[PDB]
């Protein structure tokens, strides 16, 4: 009920005497909690694929297995207004959360109708024998306009796609055939004709030409979903660096809460963290700043309160011991602690209660008693 | 406990621009994925176009061009600003907070909202 | 695009009975599809979460079923508090998630 109280049910008994009695201990508790992390996204192969001249055919897509690398697909969405940006079994808003275990990069650049052709489960004259998606195809089609790279005049004759098929094409599969096929009863083994003719087609990129025969860069990015070690995680991420404050750091994984505090200590140019005597963290580098922190422990200190005796009144007031007042009536900061509920007088008497370095506390009346 | 208010008000006429908001609290805001549902009377539900953590802004191929995205996560509440309407956005909007499992991608939108209503006449 | 045909308009109903609410898609998505119900005057509610697993607050007998292209939400036992319009989201379908029309249940007299 107050820490009178407090000392009551602690010494076992109703009837306190005079002095000074620890209690309990006063521990400051960790609001915050910081997950600061390096090692963070670098490199990939993610970019260079995005952005170049010419990425692939239609029948000669290419193909980049990408790996080794901390997946952060954030640097995609910072890019031209896309065409189309769906994505068939992965959820596009938990793409830097999900471990994926490979990843292949099959770009290739068709017209404007066939942009909607290209799916999992619809076929048609381009997704149904050039390149074909499996009904179990876990990724992204990302599609843009491209009529500015791949856009020369007088019809640029260099992209080609395969047609006629002798049989239905296969989930990733690969067709750089020549050979010239005929629909039916007509010898054509090296020359062409009325119904022979090679199996690929000019397309016709003019600016003349209006929607949907312009060219489209399209890529598709198969997120292989399995139960193996991941290879291209998701980034980590990293919160705010505060300061003065005993909070849950988590630097380079060595997790543990104190006060992060600026020491004046010179770390080397390869040692980041570091122990004191007792080999324990006393002070470390920033993850992304390689600044030299100094984390302190928490504060804490026990409490005591002094009472003059049950018989005489009930007022009484606490120490905070190994406290600077600033960590949670007068206020008065002393060598041994923080004292709350006692004021501090020039006098000098008879040291009555022990406070602590040269401190006594006594019932005394001022003019009141207090 | 869980609630999203959406006391954002509409009164404006054919042609205007009016400014909505979806405010939460009760969980993570930054940890969260906003989507904006729209419930026509009469109908179902349209779209969502949601916002990501990441600067991910999604629209419909119906939609873009007179909508626009904010994530702002001062406040901890997000709003959707729109250009000029035509006469067949009058509806009921919503926002709805899509969620997975924590190593999946199976979206169920649990979390949603309470509803604005828009009307464009005289 | 990837539609969903769900069950007629009319679908009467009592306290007590085996309602079959199918959600068939055009192609195969799997086992990819979240069930909704909007009631009259409020906002919809989820109930069944990647068409297999209750989410939480629903213990009303509301199971489902599906493999392929075969969703259906067999409803055993019916409560005069659990009657609406229900939806069916293909999350196997766009980032643009479309939804269902909508199956409201009536009560039989």
């Known amino acids: 009920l107050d820490p009178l109280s407090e000392t009551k049910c602690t010494l076992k008994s109703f009837t306190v005497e005079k002095g000074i009695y620890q209690t309990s201990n006063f521990r400051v508790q960790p609001t915050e909690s910081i997950v600061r992390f390096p090692n963070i996204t670098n490199l990939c192969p993610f970019h260079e694929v995005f952005n170049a001249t010419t990425f692939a055919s239609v029948y000669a897509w290419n193909r980049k297995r990408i790996s080794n690398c901390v997946a952060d697909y954030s640097v995609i969405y910072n890019f031209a207004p896309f065409f189309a940006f769906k994505c068939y079994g992965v959820s596009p808003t938990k793409l830097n959360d999900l471990c994926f275990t490979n990843v292949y990069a099959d770009s290739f650049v068709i017209r404007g109708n066939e942009v909607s052709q290209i799916a999992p489960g619809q076929t048609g004259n381009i997704a149904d024998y050039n390149y074909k998606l499996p009904d179990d195809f876990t990724g992204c089609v990302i599609a843009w306009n491209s009529n500015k790279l791949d856009s020369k005049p007088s019809g640029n004759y260099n992209y080609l796609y395969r047609l006629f098929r002798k049989s239905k094409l296969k989930p990733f599969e690969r067709d750089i055939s020549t050979e010239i096929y005929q629909a039916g009863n007509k010898p054509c083994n090296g020359v062409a004709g009325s119904n022979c003719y090679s199996p690929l087609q000019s397309y016709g990129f003019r600016p003349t030409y209006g929607v949907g025969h312009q060219p489209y860069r399209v890529v598709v990015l198969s997120f292989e979903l399995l139960h193996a070690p991941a290879t291209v995680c998701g980034p980590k991420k990293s919160t705010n660096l505060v300061k003065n404050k005993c909070v849950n750091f988590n630097f380079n994984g060595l997790t543990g809460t104190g006060v992060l505090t600026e020491s004046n200590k010179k770390f080397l140019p390869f040692q980041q963290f570091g122990r004191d005597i007792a080999d324990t963290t006393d002070a470390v580098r920033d993850p992304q700043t390689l600044e030299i922190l100094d984390i302190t422990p928490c504060s804490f200190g026990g409490v005591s309160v002094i009472t003059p005796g049950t018989n005489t009144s009930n007022q009484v007031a606490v120490l905070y011991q190994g406290v600077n007042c600033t960590e949670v009536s007068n206020v008065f900061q002393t060598r041994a602690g923080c004292l709350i509920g006692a004021e501090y007088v020039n006098n000098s008497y008879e040291c009555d209660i022990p406070i602590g370095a040269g401190i006594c506390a006594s019932y005394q009346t001022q003019t009141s008693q207090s | 406990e869980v609630r999203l208010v959406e006391s954002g008000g509409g009164l404006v006429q054919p042609g205007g621009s009016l400014r909505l908001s979806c405010a939460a609290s009760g969980f993570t805001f930054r940890n969260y994925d906003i989507h904006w549902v729209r419930q026509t009377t009469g109908k179902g539900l349209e779209w969502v176009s949601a916002?990501?953590?990441?600067?991910?802004?999604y629209y419909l191929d119906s939609v873009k061009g007179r909508f626009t995205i904010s994530r702002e996560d001062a406040k901890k509440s997000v709003y959707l600003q729109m250009n000029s309407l035509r006469a067949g956005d009058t509806a009921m909007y919503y926002c709805?907070?899509?969620?997975?499992?924590?190593?999946?991608?199976?979206?169920?939108?649990?979390?949603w909202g309470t509803g604005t209503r828009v009307i464009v006449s005289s | 695009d990837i539609q969903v045909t769900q069950s007629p308009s009319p679908l009467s109903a009592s306290v007590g009975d085996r309602v079959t609410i199918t959600c068939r898609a055009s192609q195969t998505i799997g086992k990819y599809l979240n069930w909704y119900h909007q009631i009259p005057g409020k906002a919809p509610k989820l109930l069944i979460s990647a068409a297999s697993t209750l989410h939480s607050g629903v213990p009303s007998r509301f199971s489902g079923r599906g493999s392929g292209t075969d969703f259906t939400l067999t409803i055993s036992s019916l409560q005069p508090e659990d009657f609406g319009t229900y939806y069916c989201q293909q999350s196997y379908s766009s980032p643009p998630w479309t939804f269902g029309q909508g199956t409201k249940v009536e009560i039989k007299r």
């Open positions: 709805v907070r899509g969620d997975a499992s924590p190593d999946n991608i199976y979206y169920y939108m649990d979390v």
């Open positions: 916002v990501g953590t990441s600067g991910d802004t």
